[PDB]
């Protein structure tokens, strides 16, 4: 009759009641995503509304039990998970206003027109064009016709969210986002929200030289495509980076290639000349996963999953996803073709599924990853390992007389660096700006000035046209218009290389790290499943320390991964200048 | 001569919290037509051996049938604990009998979800061996009584199995039969082939 038996009974009832509703909602969502008709939306909305109403009603009743009166740990985490409440502590009118603002902002971003709609038209122009004016007009038009119309809504959004955050004993909405990394445990395994900023800042000072060299080879290679628009000592203009914003630099490979005659490893032809279909692809993925000590897929996986387009006049979206419906039901939905990229996404999604099956024994509230960055980093390393020449040579898609040339290795490393290293400053700058805006450090009349000064100082990118305070540049991104946290990718990028170096060390591999394969190593896959079974039942410091042996982030493995590229990049910059001076702007004359 | 057929392929089985008992007497027991069916997932027998079941006879044999989950089958055994082994159906430590189970996904499952099978998850104390409970009185958790209406810390004691064909193996329906052998001062009458 103490304050623990009641909580245990309450948790029992909630655990056995939530499964039904969750399974029904997931089933309805899958059925809609497989057909897309007019009658399935009603069922999906009904299931979602019922589940949300049940969750809110039950979370309302769970705050009557204080936390300090319970001595066990798992029960304490379950109550902590069930006791969170956002936007439920506000007046009804304020909630209605906030919902209207969010819906209007999402809709106004969804159907923007610049003079061609964003998704089909402007993206292709940004990705493929090589004309200065052609990119310039699209960039300026989209920014002017989207950001200028989104300013007052975002001004109201920050105030409403600050009120909501302060109503929940928080200091700021940014402080509310950082709480996903907070821990409370014994002496050696705690973590506070303040240390996240310091941890992120320290990890960024150890990546700057590599970014500077990558910046100085791109600046120098684009001298030719654009003859007299970029200075040899200034910063790169924002409208020449391969995307609308510059989040990824991956579309600059044809312009910046070390050795442009030797091609990369592509095995589409040697795979079509053997009559391979999707079932073969997934069987090979399953063989790879069972060769490292992990189990095999269930029988319902092969019967209920969708692995190809239906050509019988039913419409589908089939963006590659992995589903965990519940009650032992696992499905994968993907429109598979016979290229190599699909062959790698198969491994990625199979890793996603393999993580879900491990923690099915945990209670309902603890069936998720340790934090928001683990679940993607787990799936990334499988794709990293499954694209090496050793694996392809063993499988059969590559002849055994193959020779590993170093120039191809340099090409591969440069492409990977353009994909990975080029996005860290963008994420760091965006998150720092959003935190400072939420915290009230930045005055409301100096948003764009601080934005572009920070861009110049950190990422080395300058605007082509000056902007006053009537614009709003951050809102043009998808994750800013619709409220989503953005610090996941930094942590995922660190974690994946942490895990990869640890497992490669366990596998007794010799040589450079980028040529590592963990196939046919039962110890490597046996150690990894120790953290996969934990789920959210123990702090993520345990999850990190079990595998790698450390309790904090470390960027050393990532730099160890790019060592040959660092050595080669340092030599071709002898007759060049490293760094950028933020006094050059391309409208001074 | 007697129906070990009307216990095994009956149209409708019973819930676990209300388990049905059938007694067989004055008959000849054929235990070879069961062990060679090749459609039974588990055929464990305690206290006897399946080969020697035809030799020594008894007075009465009791058969109990019910429906449980796939991963709760291992709780039907002596000295096992769990949700269903202390609130629904219990077996004594000194057991003499057999436990038989097989998959029933093709029958006890519907797309909309079957809801006619229940089990008990709240009770004040464990069950004595071979004891059955049917009452539906509202369970009391706190010290403040609630008068016949569910509210705060007052819970209904029964819950339903949501069987659907798309579930995994561990969440699919299974049909279980338990046989017990009775030997007392009454004359032994049930045994078979000579
Ligand atoms: C875990 O908690 C301990 C104690 O609450 C933290 O250690 C303190 O850290 C502050 C940092 O400003 C110091 O001023 C104190 O002197 C420390 N106290 C002790 C006893 O060491 C520790 O930092 C927490 N862990 C993390 C990761 O934040
Ligand atoms: C797939 O590539 C193989 C490898 O060369 C091709 O095989 C040759 O095909 C010609 C014409 O059929 C034969 O005369 C040669 O003897 C084959 N060489 C070898 C070593 O196999 C083949 O043509 C391609 N696709 C297929 C199977 O037709
Ligand atoms: C997981 O299931 C697959 C199902 O195919 C198993 O693969 C079979 O393994 C047996 C030997 O155990 C072989 O004789 C079959 O030829 C395999 N099938 C195929 C299609 O190759 C696999 O062994 C199972 N994994 C484990 C650990 O038992
Ligand atoms: C319960 O009914 C099934 C059929 O619904 C019986 O299966 C029969 O098994 C015998 C052998 O034992 C076969 O010769 C028959 O062909 C099967 N089918 C039928 C329709 O008889 C099953 O044996 C029955 N269970 C018992 C008798 O215990
Ligand atoms: C749903 O999709 C299946 C095949 O994926 C199709 O057979 C069925 O007709 C679709 N539903 C409706 C209502 O048409
Ligand atoms: Zn993924």
Residue numbers in the entry:
A (entry chain A): 19 to 133, 142 to 615
B (entry chain B): 335 to 528
From the reporting publication:
In the PT S/rdACE2 complex, one RBD of PT S was observed to interact with the peptidase domain (PD) of rdACE2, while the other two RBDs were in a downward conformation. To obtain a high-resolution view of the RBD/ACE2 interface, local refinement was performed, resulting in the determination of the PT RBD/rdACE2 and Alpha S RBD/rdACE2 structures at 2.64 Å and 3.16 Å, respectively. As previously reported, the interacting residues of the RBD can be divided into two patches. In patch 1 of both PT and Alpha RBD, S477 and N487 form hydrogen bonds (H-bonds) with Q18 and Y83, respectively. In PT RBD, Q493 in patch 1 binds to Y34 of the rdACE2, whereas in Alpha RBD, Q493 forms an H-bond contact with E35. Moving to patch 2, T500 and N501 of both PT and Alpha RBD form H-bonds with Y41 of rdACE2, while G502 of these two RBDs forms an H-bond with R353 of rdACE2. Furthermore, in PT RBD, Y449 forms an H-bond contact with E38 and Q42 of rdACE2. Additionally, in PT RBD, G496 binds to E38 of rdACE2 via an H-bond. Through this structural analysis, we observed that the binding interface of PT RBD/hACE2 is larger than that of PT RBD/rdACE2. Specifically, residues Y473, G476, E484 and S494 of PT RBD were found to be involved in binding to hACE2 but not to rdACE2.
